[PDB]
Amino acid sequence: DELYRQSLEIISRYLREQATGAKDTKPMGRSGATSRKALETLRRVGDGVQRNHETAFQGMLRKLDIKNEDDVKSLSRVMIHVFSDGVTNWGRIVTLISFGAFVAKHLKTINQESCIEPLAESITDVLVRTKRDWLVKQRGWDGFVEFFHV
Ligand SMILES: Cc1n[nH]c(C)c1-c1cccc2c(CCCOc3cccc4ccccc34)c(C(=O)O)[nH]c12
Ligand SMILES: Cc1n[nH]c(C)c1-c1cccc2c(CCCOc3cccc4ccccc34)c(C(=O)O)[nH]c12
């Protein structure tokens, strides 16, 4: 599943980098050129989403109890419901991933750096399960990068 693999690469890298501060230097798989600009776009736009929605993000983070990987999987119930309701557009997707980064940074501060990879898998699973046809119609990550271009 190449859309899943590329999406997990992009989402995983962004959440880990936000949480640790460090860029992951390891090589990308294929479509790495698109994955790179998608990461550039996340750093640029995603960082501002977290600032601009800080109150709402902190409020949702308070409502989440994440003690183990079973609780990461339980979150996916909230993620599917809130993300499935409403209009589909690239703003929804960048919000989904930016709140992922906001949660991963918290998970690192509480010594749960380990839940970050499962969190990224859940986010990617929800994104592709709910929006695969729309994502393909929009040229996937090439569409994401074009949308936020400039
Ligand atoms: C119109 C609407 N209704 N509901 C939702 C969700 C959206 C929506 C639609 C599109 C984007 C967003 C965003 C991201 C922040 C602003 O986006 C941009 C940032 C930088 C350059 C851009 C160049 C072109 C277009 C957007 C850009 C948000 C958000 O952060 O809250 N919401 C968006
Ligand atoms: C409550 C509220 N008020 N104003 C805004 C902005 C928010 C808000 C706060 C947080 C996330 C969102 C989303 C994305 C869909 C739901 O994503 C998640 C829900 C639960 C756990 C998660 C753990 C990791 C990653 C994603 C998660 C939206 C949206 O889709 O429009 N809005 C959100």
* Distance, first Cα to last Cα, the chain: 30
Classified as helix, coil or strand, 101 is helix
Q: How many structural domains comprise the chain?
A: 1
116 neighbors 16 (Cβ within 8 angstroms): yes
Residues in contact with ligand 1 by the CB-under-6-Å rule are: 45, 49, 52, 87, 89-92, 94-95, 148
Q: Which of 110, 122, 27, 16 is nearest to 67 (CA)?
A: 110
10 neighbors 141 (Cβ within 8 angstroms): yes
Which residue's CA lies nearest to atom 19 of ligand 2? 79
The experimental technique behind this entry is X-ray
CB 106 less than 6 A from any atom of ligand 2: no
The helix (run of H) or strand (run of E) holding residue 93 is helix 90-109
CATH number at residue 4: 1.10.437.10
Q: Which ligand sits nearest to residue 57's alpha carbon?
A: 2
Q: Name residue 19's amino acid.
A: A
| Domain with 82 in it | 1-148
Which residue's CA lies nearest to atom 4 of ligand 1? 91
Resolution (A): 1.6
Q: Which of 31, 32, 34, 12 is nearest to 23 (CA)?
A: 12
CA distance 55 to 46: 15
